[model samples]
Target chain A: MSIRSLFGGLREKILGKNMKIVFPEGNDERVVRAAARLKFEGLLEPIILGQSEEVRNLLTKLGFADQDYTIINPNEYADFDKMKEAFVEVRKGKATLEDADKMLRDVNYFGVMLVKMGLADGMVSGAIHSTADTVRPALQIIKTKPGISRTSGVFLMNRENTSERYVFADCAINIDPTAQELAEIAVNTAETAKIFDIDPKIAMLSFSTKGSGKAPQVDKVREATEIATGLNPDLALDGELQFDAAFVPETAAIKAPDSAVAGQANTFVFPDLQSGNIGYKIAQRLGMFDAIGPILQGLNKPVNDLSRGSSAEDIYKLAIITAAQAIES
Target chain B: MSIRSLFGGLREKILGKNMKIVFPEGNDERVVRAAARLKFEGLLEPIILGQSEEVRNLLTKLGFADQDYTIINPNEYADFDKMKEAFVEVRKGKATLEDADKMLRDVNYFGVMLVKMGLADGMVSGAIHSTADTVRPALQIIKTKPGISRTSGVFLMNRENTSERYVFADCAINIDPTAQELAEIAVNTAETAKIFDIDPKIAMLSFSTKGSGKAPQVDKVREATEIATGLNPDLALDGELQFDAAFVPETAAIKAPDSAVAGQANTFVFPDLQSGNIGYKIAQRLGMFDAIGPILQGLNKPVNDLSRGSSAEDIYKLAIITAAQAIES
Candidate 1:
């Protein structure tokens, strides 16, 4: 089925669940307000991380009385010392005890850490913080599972009820990577594909088809193909190809006659971060694919990051997606 | 206007002229036979370049000799010495004199060179020669214009009667370009856009929108924007942008609020060759744009290259396009 059909299924599944989500930056009026609506409608179980008094003041100012949401304060927890100890251990050589203590006072980091400590199901932030700021704490406490090389993101592009989600590896992390690194990125992205219910048919896209063009960059993709396939020979993967041969049946028949993944590739592996970044935006903008991420994957728990420029609505939706990822993983 | 409408205008404008096109490959009897049909219908000027005896024999054997085409032989040039000198000058450093002499004996190079040296208005010859073999002799002789930085290609994509041609800059060359190099690509592509009757509103597309992502590659695009603006500031240019910000009106509004080139950018400038190659193909396959070229531009003379695997019809159409480009330039 096409991506559009899949998204419809996902929306229906989401609507049925009345999923719960947590917001770390609940001190922001926008976050608190959206959380309140999600809670009131029973669409989510939103846990806001902030002092109760400050949350009330912000909600009252925004003309919404706090209702049906959990507000937790680190200062008043019975297990405050235990939580602090856990936080220090997670942040262990990265920060001083005083630095960790100061970070605990910050709602964004504190609440996300709380999620890792089992206080919440998932945490979404970055409206008031950068992607690094939002994800670093999560990586520290809710770090990647063993055997995972790096984190990647996926955009669950949904239009109406149809969804086609593509896993964009290290779109938010790695920049110019080697072939081996690209293979790792592919592995991480493939993992994400399975998580999102997409059958990963990976195509390592390049300007050249096979050996038409020669360069180190093209070689990297070619090498990545060898590595990815060697890692899993039966994996649905093809590479060192242009987009035409990868996606067009006629072109694929002519250019890559023997490739199973040619012309039917659903998971695109870009050579570098630059291509990955530009390629997906083109799909979103020109092709009308609803670009969902930078959805962080490869972590042990589902603590996602958002673009600092994201709005409250984007943050809320991401929370639902993050929660789903946690459940699916 | 849509691509279909654009192509329609082009078809009507060119169809009335009944343009003549020459193909040098005798092996592609199918394409030649098809051209013969078009010629018989008074829709084209058709010529086949090959050994005179072979061409005639092939046509007779295939039962498709309508006697409405021209055939040329490499051995019949009364001005053989002058032709050899011109060919030698172009291939001086690249090939030995003996190699040049041997190439002259080969009808493909000699015939295509003859066309470039003004024996015919246009010639197409990729069915038997590789794209490199097809274009190399021409590039060696015709060379770049005085101010031209490098050559680029464009595909005049059409479906039905509507035409939407997109100029892809340096898609066949300049793999990993610096910001300054990208600017040159933009300038070159803009020239091609004008040739194709486009207004040349250029968009320097990236994954980031005006430095949203802090990567050197993004900076390269940003720097290219400045270079392009500095070189041709009066030209409508917006860049260091996402594809959405380039083409979609709403996303443009959000991502680049101050950009005049945003939302309505007709010419998309990719960050690198890989993106340019892949982005265009995705549009072609998924968006249903009929890919026309590797249409050669950015030379002093109207010299077009053909893919080695190109069909006879492809050559004929490209010959017409090359002629059109020559006349326009």
Candidate 2:
């Protein structure tokens, strides 16, 4: 089956279920349109945050019907006070009551609170906001999982002409990361790979392939690959592999003959965000892969951010990924 | 015309010109077979160095005619004294008469001295030796040109099924170079691109596209782009561009609308050896490009090296590149 049918099946499983996904930028036309598509497809009960009348008008203005979508106006919500108090408690005196009250008015903060309080399964926002605007509250509220000190980002690169789907990670976050952070990105991306039914043979990509060249950059990625191996003994990942040795069998045979993951890697962890960003964009724009994420990983729950220029199709896909991420966990 | 015919025309021009190319690894079977083919085509005279009778026996045993190619024995050469004198002069007080005499007995040193003394137009070795072994003699004697301080390597990345050719640079040498060295590589590689008949539009590659990301790595590439521009004001080049923005028209339209080289860069200078090594390999193995060289550039004359596992075709092509390099300057 194609990757299309596979995700369609996942969508079918989540259909009519009470798997709620909150949209923070309900005023964004892109978000409103995507929310309408999600609502109509029975994909999720979208918890769109804005004043009920205002959000409805945006949906209508975007030529979309927001049927059965949950429009949570924070000012009118029954649990606004509780949300503010809980936000303060999570802030642990760092945020004053006035701080909590003011933050709740910020739609991204309100939407995150919905997910934090188990009112929704996950979140997708940043369609018209800077990455920091969408990521800041999620970091303060949701924070990281038990061992992860850094939250990383991942992209699910899909080829429409084939069932070839690969996970490429830390493309949106973790700039100039330490070796430990790179290890975390590798293991975390592998975990996300599993949710997509990927068997997760990971390649830690760098400019060098198997010590044919050397530098601090090569050493850092080598260190990350080693640490990742120790971190997850079950993971089939190896690195300090160049892009070719990691992915192509002939190159692997010539450059890294002993590596098991050399020619068969499906998930790739870039050494840092710059390489990750440029690499993914190259694969997307040049190779014509459907570059899917910057999907946030290592959070306690999924709260992925969209590019400010995200298409309606991009929003639709990430919404499903979030639902699957929540259900699988 | 196709790249195949383009090179064929180049081969035809070099044919019967009696230009000599020295091979240090005369005993290597790949070099032996390649020498025979080069001789049969009347493309540059092959100046092979070895024990004359034994090298001839190997050629005959392999069913190849060794008749026309010049086999030079260092022990029996009439101008051994002249070569040894030149070597001592090139060494410039670093070597005495004894050191020069002993070094000339070594195959690589002899091959390099031949190029240095104008007995051969170029030298190609490294078939059975470490890259250092093949490169050291040339570095010690030939050195850099008037303004260039570093010798960089470029790969003429050609798509076999099409005349699409690209020059990928400094993939073999210059690890973690300074901005200055990167600029040298860019300028040197641009010159090499001209040899392959590629109308050079250079791209100084980086993890960041323009200002999309920031780090010393990104800053280094941007600085190199500026320096390369200064080094050659008439050159068409720009950076720091991501791979997609540099090579893909759609990405360039979005990410680098004002770049002269953005959508049409025929020459790409990678930030360092690591990226260059990995980047060229990716395009070679995954995208199925025919990668030629570690074609050494920025030297006064031409001297290229072959991987120990190089096929006859690799030797044949590089020999022509060496001839072209010598004939150009």
Candidate 3:
């Protein structure tokens, strides 16, 4: 099933919950349109973080009803003083009151602050901004979850004609993660899989299968597999596996027959961002799989960054997915 | 076209050249079968290195007329003394005359020595041996080509539909190539592409597209792009590109608009083996592209290695490709 079809269940779970999602790029037409549709579909409430007049004009032009939509102008936010105080406290002396006030005027920072204050359940941005622009504010304000030292990103890969769905992780963040970091990515991805209703069998991918090849790179995966197995003893997981050993049953039977995850792993944890980034794109372009998310994971709150080239439909899907993440959190 | 369909032109070019390809694992049934077909096709003369009686019997059982195939028993070769002397000379002080005699008894060494002696044009083995076992003798004897510091491997990725053909390099060798090594791989893969009738537009793959992302890894690719351009300024090449920026025209228009090779790059040079290996497998398993070769490149003469699990059909194709490589040399 495609992501739209798969999200049906998530829609059911999140529908009528009135889960409020912050849209920092409310000034961007695609963001406004996607957020408007989310409001109309009754999937989530759009908390637009742009000037009220500009956002309202954009919404009205797009033929969406303006009533009941929350458009919070960052410069004119009613709880500006309260949000600034919370920001300074969260920054732990890293930011002063003046610094917080100035930073909070930026829509992304202000939008994330809304999530920090429990005014919105989650935030989705990056339509017109760089990934760092959207992700940095969330990292500083909302932060990672308990025991997760860092956050990672995952993409849910789906093929339209077949039920071939897969999870690929840390493709967006963590350039060259250490063994411990890779393990955390693996565990977090397995959890991410469950939110999408996938039965998570995780494969920690390397260029080598078992001990068939050797390198410091291969050694990292071996160590990561051990750490991930320890982190969740009952999680269906194994590594250090080559992509073939992980995905192809015949290859797995020869290379890793005993592994519960090999040959049938729906979730793949790439050893580094090079493999993760390149691997998912290859699947997307050549295999023609629809890649979704780089959906931020291990965050204390749900904050997803959109690709700068993303379409309105992409934003719409991501908005629904963000709402689902909020429900799971 | 599939590899079989594409090799037609190569077969035409080498038909009457009488190129000799040494098969050290001629005792293996698949090797024998494939070698026999090469002889019947008149594409290449198979130099089978094994006990004469054992290889001959295997050939006879396979219903090949044993008259024309050159079956050489390593222990009973007429020029064993000559081969030992040449081996000792090639090994410098590394091997004694006694060591030469013993090493020459190994079919891989003896077969490689045949190429070194100009008795054969190339060698193909590893159907029943480790890559080290097959590559070690060639490295010691045949060696890398002039001006080439190291050898790398490439896979010719072809899809059965849509005439989709791509070249991916350094996937099988070079664990984590330095910038110079990666540049060499890029240059060599471009040359390899020409041999297969592909007009090479090369992209040096990284997670970054021309500094959009940052890391020492991305810096290495940036350096590699410069080095590769210097090595072959006439070649259509560009990089430090992400897969999307390299392969998709729309992405290329935005991320790398000025690059000559950004979009429609038929040859892709991966920054490291981890990316190359994982990238190619993702294309193979998920994209359903037929991957051929880890075809050894930069060697003085053509020498190929087959996976242990490769079928007779795979060997038949590789033998033709090996013959093609020999003709190009």
Going through the candidates in the order shown, the clash numbers are 18, 0, 0
| Residue pairs in clash, model 2 | none
The digit string of per-residue lDDT tens for model 3 on A1-329 reads 66666888778989999899999987889998888888888899989988888899998898888777888999997889989999989887697998998999999999899999999999899989999998899999999898687889899999978779889979989999989999999889888898888999999888899999989999999998899899889789898988999899999999988989888888999988988898899999998998885899988889999997898988988888888989877
Give the TM-score of each candidate. Answer: 0.86, 0.92, 0.97
Q: Rank the candidates by DockQ, best first.
A: 3, 1, 2
Per-residue CA lDDT of candidate 3, range B1-329, in tens? 66776888778878989999999997789999988888887888899988887889988898877676788999888989988999889777786798988889999999899999999999889899999998888999999888577889999999978789999978998999999889988998898898888999999998899889999999999898899999989999897999999999998999998899887999999878888898999999999998986899998889899996898988887888888888777
As for candidate 3, its clashing pairs are none
For model 2, how does the per-residue alpha-carbon lDDT over A146-233 read when each residue is reduced to its tens digit? 8788988888887758567898868777777788998988888888888777899899887677886678888998999999999998
Q: For this target, which candidate reaches the highest DockQ against the unseen true structure?
A: 3
Model 1, B75-176: lDDT tens digits are 665666677777777666765666766677665677667766766555566665677776676667666667666666765544433344555556666687
Candidate 1 docking class:
medium
> Candidate 1's error at A271, in angstroms?
1.9
Per-residue accuracy of model 1 over A159-230 as CA lDDT, tens digit each = 433344555545557677778767767776776677567788888889988888888889999999999887
lDDT of 3 at A266: 89
lDDT values for all models: 0.70, 0.82, 0.89
Task: Locate the minimum summed-lDDT window of 10 residues in model 2 chain A.
Answer: A278-287
TM-score of chain B of each: 0.83, 0.95, 0.97
Candidate 1 error regions (>4 Å): A1-21, A27-30, A33-44, A57-68, A74-94, A158-172, A232-234, A307-316, B1-22, B30-47, B58-68, B75-79, B93-95, B157-166, B307-313
